[PDB]
Design the sequence.
């Protein structure tokens, strides 16, 4: 999902 | 006093001073509540707050200069005043949930922009980034009454009801009959004769929505997943009327990631567009290519809505907040990371008469007054 953020922790 | 509550992703401290990266329940923000806000707005991993005094505060990821604080790399973990604007009374900040640029409209009708400069979305005849707000000279002689920003383009409308767009021209999102990038605010001539009162801009391969004072909703730009609301998937670079919403009394329009939403005066919510991860609120994740009423809210008078990338928020006239869509980072506010397939009552706000909501890419805001 191109529009999902990643949790950088 | 305006109490402000925040939840969702917090990896870059875009929630303004909470510990933990996934805030799964709405949490009182003492930093934001202390400001006396009239508006909170959410961008890509970013949060902006406009106060009654007319100042602007920002927190979160600072890359590309999202926040307009003169910086370009790290994190602003505590809301900090955009001091470049301290000599103006700001009325509203416009930013897309997946956006890295923003605009600000003052009470006397001036527009500033800042952040990522790609494709001319800042409106200064260039593709240059702006780490600090800069006045859009092209609009200096127009009394701008509202603003909106997508991920790659921007819009403003005058008190006479004319609409300007600028930024990335690809896939027709600017509405001028071609796909040419505009580094400058350009008037949408096709809409003269209509008094445009709101505009909303999408992200990536983006759509654009406009609403006239007669209740007419127009859409143009990228057509993928049916987010233009007229069936199929064909894009266009000329505003077209979304016939299905005529006569419905639409009073607010928003664009999430690849989907569109409209709220009516009588309190009904319509959504259409990309269905993946349940961002539309119809209980399934199929696409919806013409507007459809969110049945999960039938009988509830919704007074305000907000869209993130993959989630939506809606407030009833009695102060209850409903959420639907993706929940990878807790942005649904149901205490878990489980998707809300249908509109669901948000936990932890009982006794707080919420009047307004806001969303960023993966985070959520609710506040009282």
Sequence:
């Amino acid at each position: 999902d191109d529009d999902k953020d990643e949790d950088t922790h | 006093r305006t109490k402000v509550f925040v939840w969702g992703l917090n990896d870059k401290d875009q929630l303004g001073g909470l510990k933990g990266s996934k805030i799964k329940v709405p949490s009182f923000s003492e930093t934001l509540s202390a400001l006396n806000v009239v508006q909170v707005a959410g961008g890509s991993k970013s949060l902006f707050a406009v106060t009654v005094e007319g100042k602007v505060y920002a927190c979160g990821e600072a890359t590309n200069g999202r926040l307009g604080l003169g910086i370009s790399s790290g994190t602003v973990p505590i809301p900090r005043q955009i001091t470049a604007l301290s000599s103006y009374v700001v009325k509203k900040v416009a930013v897309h949930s997946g956006g890295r640029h923003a605009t600000a409209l003052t009470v006397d009708g001036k527009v500033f922009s800042w952040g990522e400069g790609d494709d001319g979305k800042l409106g200064h005849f260039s593709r240059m980034n702006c780490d600090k707000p800069r006045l859009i000279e092209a609009l200096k002689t127009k009394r701008i009454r509202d603003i909106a920003c997508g991920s790659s383009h921007s819009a403003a409308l005058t008190s006479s009801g004319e609409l300007y767009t600028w930024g990335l021209g690809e896939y027709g999102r600017l509405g001028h009959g071609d796909n040419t990038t505009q580094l400058k605010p350009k008037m949408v001539k096709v809409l003269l004769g209509h008094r445009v009162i709101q505009v909303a801009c999408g992200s990536r391969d983006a759509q654009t929505l406009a609403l006239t004072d007669e209740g007419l909703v127009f859409s143009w730009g990228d057509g993928d997943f049916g987010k233009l609301g007229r069936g199929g998937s064909e894009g266009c670079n000329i505003p077209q009327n979304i016939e299905r919403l005529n006569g419905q009394g639409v009073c607010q329009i928003e664009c999430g990631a690849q989907f569109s939403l409209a709220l009516t005066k009588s309190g009904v919510v319509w959504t259409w567009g990309k269905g993946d991860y349940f961002r539309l609120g119809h209980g399934s994740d199929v696409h919806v290519r013409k507007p459809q009423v969110v049945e999960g809210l039938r009988g509830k008078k919704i007074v305000h809505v907000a869209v993130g990338a993959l989630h939506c928020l809606a407030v009833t006239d009695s102060g209850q907040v409903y959420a639907w869509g993706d929940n990878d980072h807790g942005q649904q506010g149901n205490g878990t990371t489980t998707v809300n397939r249908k509109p669901t009552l948000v936990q932890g706000l009982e006794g707080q008469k919420i009047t307004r909501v806001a969303c960023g890419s993966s985070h959520s805001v609710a506040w009282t007054t």
Remarks:
- The two ends of chain B are 7 Å apart (CA to CA).
- Chain B has one domain: 1-369.
